[PDB]
Design a protein around this ligand. Structure first.
Ligand SMILES: *C(=O)CCCCCCCCCCCCC
Ligand SMILES: *C(=O)CCCCCCCCCCCCC
Ligand SMILES: *C(=O)CCCCCCCCCCCCC
Ligand SMILES: *CCCCCCCC[C@H](*)CCCCC(*)=O
Ligand SMILES: *CCCCCCCC[C@H](*)CCCCC(*)=O
Ligand SMILES: *CCCCCCCC[C@H](*)CCCCC(*)=O
Ligand SMILES: [Cl-]
Ligand SMILES: [Cl-]
Ligand SMILES: [Zn+2]
Ligand SMILES: [Zn+2]
Lengths: 21, 29, 29, 21, 29, 21, 29, 21, 29, 21, 29, 21
């Protein structure tokens, strides 16, 4: 999920787009 | 984990600003 | 309309605290 | 929607819980 | 009234920074 | 109250300090 | 402690959303 | 206080109610 | 005027996420 | 200014990027 | 560093509340 | 910078004034 991905390492805005609807 | 909760708090607002009209989904477990 | 954008910014944080481990689907207007 | 209902009227904890998974 | 609720949400954070170790009592209208 | 005074007029640091313990 | 300060920052907003009309008190020391 | 209680461990909303006025 | 102060409070956080390591200069009206 | 433009109209990511260093 | 990013997020809002009309500058690197 | 100063140790409001314009 996003917690194991974007909290252990800083995510770019492009990587944040993977969790939009 | 409290620090995990803090990061998720900042994750939600980052997702809201990035997604916008599309919306987003947050699911820790 | 900006004030709705600000209100939605507070709504997602409120949803984050209320839902917790359940998670949520944010679908704006 | 959550915006139409909660940005016009103050939603309580039990109203906001309706939109959780 | 929602905009007061948003304003109060910013007021408590401002009080938290200003008071620091003193603490505060938040009593809304 | 703090809401009646600071949500109608911008309160500075010294105004907000009045409500600390 | 900086991390203690960060958690207290999130504690204040959580208390504000939970308490509401009653208000709340924050006292680190 | 709340710092030693709800920051070392995650508090439920019921436990947060103990610090309302 | 308070609502601009609230809007500026959200703008700086948005700038913080967008700029990242570049940094920014916030100059209000 | 950023306030005159973004507090009257919703600024996107690419509009806000204009004010970065 | 994620925790460094979290503190910078709180630094920006603290600077905004402290500086006010003068504005501020944030530069991590 | 401010990250090495006000994040490793808690800064007073006076120390935060050093980074205003
Ligand atoms: C549910 O508990 C998710 C399972 C993995 C937990 C990861 C906990 C650590 C997450 C990183 C937090 C980083 C905070 C800066
Ligand atoms: C005043 O200093 C309170 C006395 C106890 C200090 C506890 C410091 C640690 C608090 C937990 C912070 C957790 C952050 C995620
Ligand atoms: C750019 O990366 C700045 C160079 C120094 C990095 C310091 C990283 C640690 C900063 C303290 C964070 C404290 C969080 C509570
Ligand atoms: C006039 C005071 C501010 C309120 C603006 C009108 C309400 C928001 C517009 C209607 C909601 C739909 C927004 C669509 O983009
Ligand atoms: C018409 C613009 C929005 C302002 C709403 C009126 C001010 C708030 C109502 C009076 C304050 C007391 C709130 C009690 O619940
Ligand atoms: C009447 C609804 C609230 C909007 C207030 C008027 C807009 C802000 C005033 C003009 C901007 C300059 C602010 C200077 O201090
Ligand atoms: Cl944090
Ligand atoms: Cl707001
Ligand atoms: Zn706000
Ligand atoms: Zn934080």
């Amino acid at each position: 999920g996003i917690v194991e991905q974007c909290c252990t390492s800083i995510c770019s805005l492009y990587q944040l787009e993977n969790y939009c609807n | 984990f409290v620090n995990q909760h803090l990061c998720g708090s900042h994750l939600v607002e980052a997702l809201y600003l990035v997604c916008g009209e599309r919306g987003f989904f947050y699911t820790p477990k």
